[PDB]
Amino acid sequence: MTTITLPALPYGYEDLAPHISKETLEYHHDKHHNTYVVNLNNLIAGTDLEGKTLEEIIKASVGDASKAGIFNNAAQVWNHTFYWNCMAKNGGGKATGALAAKIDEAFGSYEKFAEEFAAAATTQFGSGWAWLVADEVNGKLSIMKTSNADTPLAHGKVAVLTIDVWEHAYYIDFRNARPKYISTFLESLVNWDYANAKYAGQEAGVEK
Amino acid sequence: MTTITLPALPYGYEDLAPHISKETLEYHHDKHHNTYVVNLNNLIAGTDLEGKTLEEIIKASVGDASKAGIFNNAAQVWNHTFYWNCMAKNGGGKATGALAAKIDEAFGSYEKFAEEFAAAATTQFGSGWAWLVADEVNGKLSIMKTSNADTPLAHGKVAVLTIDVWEHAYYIDFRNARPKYISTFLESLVNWDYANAKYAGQEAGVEK
Numbered sequence: 001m002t003t004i005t006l007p008a009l010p011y012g013y014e015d016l017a018p019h020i021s022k023e024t025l026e027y028h029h030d031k032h033h034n035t036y037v038v039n040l041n042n043l044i045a046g047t048d049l050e051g052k053t054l055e056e057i058i059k060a061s062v063g064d065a066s067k068a069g070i071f072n073n074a075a076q077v078w079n080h081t082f083y084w085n086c087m088a089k090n091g092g093g094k095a096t097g098a099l100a101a102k103i104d105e106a107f108g109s110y111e112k113f114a115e116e117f118a119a120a121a122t123t124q125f126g127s128g129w130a131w132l133v134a135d136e137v138n139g140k141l142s143i144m145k146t147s148n149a150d151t152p153l154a155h156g157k158v159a160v161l162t163i164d165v166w167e168h169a170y171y172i173d174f175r176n177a178r179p180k181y182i183s184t185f186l187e188s189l190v191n192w193d194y195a196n197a198k199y200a201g202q203e204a205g206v207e208k
Numbered sequence: 209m210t211t212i213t214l215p216a217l218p219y220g221y222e223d224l225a226p227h228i229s230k231e232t233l234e235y236h237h238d239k240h241h242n243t244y245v246v247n248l249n250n251l252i253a254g255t256d257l258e259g260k261t262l263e264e265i266i267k268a269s270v271g272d273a274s275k276a277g278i279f280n281n282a283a284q285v286w287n288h289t290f291y292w293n294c295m296a297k298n299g300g301g302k303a304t305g306a307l308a309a310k311i312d313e314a315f316g317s318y319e320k321f322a323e324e325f326a327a328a329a330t331t332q333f334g335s336g337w338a339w340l341v342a343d344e345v346n347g348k349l350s351i352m353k354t355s356n357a358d359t360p361l362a363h364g365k366v367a368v369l370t371i372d373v374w375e376h377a378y379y380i381d382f383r384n385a386r387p388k389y390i391s392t393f394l395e396s397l398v399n400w401d402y403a404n405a406k407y408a409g410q411e412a413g414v415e416k
């Protein structure tokens with residue numbers, strides 16, 4: 001049977017510097033993301049979910065209180081892998097690819113999209129995520145926020161871009177200054193090539 | 209009219225060392241707790257809640273979606289003040305005062321209480337709090353966990369002890385090792401004198 005794996009970061013541990021440090025990537029990927037993988041494999045071992053894909057596990061556990069631990073760990077594995085691929089060395093700034101025109105259509109301009117995405121990331125209370133999503137591949141774009149592990153697949157939406165706003169994502173480099181982390185993400189980290197692939201339902205990134 | 213204030217810590221910024229550092233107390237109290245105070249005062253200014261006590265504001269906003277920002281900030285002001293007073297230099301260990309016998313009655317022993325309190329603190333997913341509570345002053349003890357800003361007053365319960373398990377409470381000193389923070393809290397930080405006062409409905413601590 002297949003097993004859930006911790007994918008490698010799609011870049012080196014100094015490649016997001018000085019925006020996100022080596023130390024953050026070490027704790028965030030090598031400890032937090034790893035723990036979600038380990039916990040999920042332990043929870044599904046010897047059950048009817050062993051050997052299913054990560055997305056099958058999320059779909060099988062969403063909305064089921066008796067499977068909250070499975071959902072929380074599986075959705076967090078998926079969200080972190082999505083997040084790492086949403087960043088890149090020399091990323092950030094205005095959109096490239098097909099998403100540029102689609103962002104202008106949905107939001108009016110890149111700057112309006114960035115304002116709305118930053119507001120979602122800023123106002124998510126507690127732990128969670130902010131997302132650019134589509135209703136379907138190549139479809140209508142919108143912004144949503146989620147709490148804790150919740151994720152666009154659990155709402156039938158297609159994730160396109162995400163930022164993790166759990167405190168561990170930014171506390172080492174920014175302490176309480178979540179807005180500065182969010183601005184840094186938009187200005188200097190966003191990977192539009194991955195976002196475009198996800199919007200177009202294409203394969204991309206390091207996801208296993 | 210009265211205003212909501214940031215109470216001083218009830219000890220010096222090195223007084224919890226090495227268990228909780230000066231740096232954590234600076235960010236956690238001087239930045240996070242302060243921000244909840246500032247936000248709450250801004251939200252109630254010029255409204256019918258200005259000049260009410262902190263507990264009146266929580267009671268007026270609980271369960272009202274249109275007042276979620278007021279509730280989240282007011283409950284977090286209260287929770288942090290409660291939390292600081294739940295710690296002390298040379299604290300920790302088995303209970304003193306009336307609570308010792310009440311803990312034996314409710315949980316069987318101090319060690320069983322500590323196990324259950326640590327489990328609540330460990331399994332709270334995302335941001336939140338773990339609590340020893342009573343159903344009324346001098347009443348029946350139990351443990352509960354809350355998510356984000358939620359707090360025993362919003363459930364008609366009397367808070368007796370709390371630990372903050374938002375990541376900012378421990379990330380500077382423990383990084384991802386929340387269990388080590390929880391053990392450190394029980395072994396070395398708990399202030400039973402404050403907990404006893406709260407259980408007995410008496411006045412105590414630095415709360416303004």
Ligand SMILES: Cc1cc2nc3c(=O)[nH]c(=O)nc-3n(C[C@H](O)[C@H](O)[C@H](O)COP(=O)(O)O)c2cc1C
Pocket residue numbers: 003004005006007053054055077078081082207208
């Ligand atoms: C955005 C995204 C993130 C994923 N993250 C992981 C992951 O962290 N661990 C894992 O085992 N599978 C993860 N997967 C699933 C695998 O990439 C892969 O789709 C699955 O193992 C099925 O294999 P196949 O695509 O070669 O048929 C992820 C998939 C997607 C779309």
Ligand SMILES: Cc1cc2nc3c(=O)[nH]c(=O)nc-3n(C[C@H](O)[C@H](O)[C@H](O)COP(=O)(O)O)c2cc1C
Pocket residue numbers: 211212213214215261262263285286289290415416
């Ligand atoms: C546990 C606890 C925490 C509190 N924290 C604060 C606080 O951080 N800021 C504040 O303005 N009032 C806080 N209060 C309310 C004040 O301590 C006080 O009760 C209120 O201002 C009413 O004043 P009085 O007790 O002198 O009549 C807190 C009260 C309690 C019980």
Ligand SMILES: [Fe+3]
Pocket residue numbers: 028032080164166168169
């Ligand atoms: Fe994270």
Ligand SMILES: [Fe+3]
Pocket residue numbers: 236240288372374376377
């Ligand atoms: Fe806190």
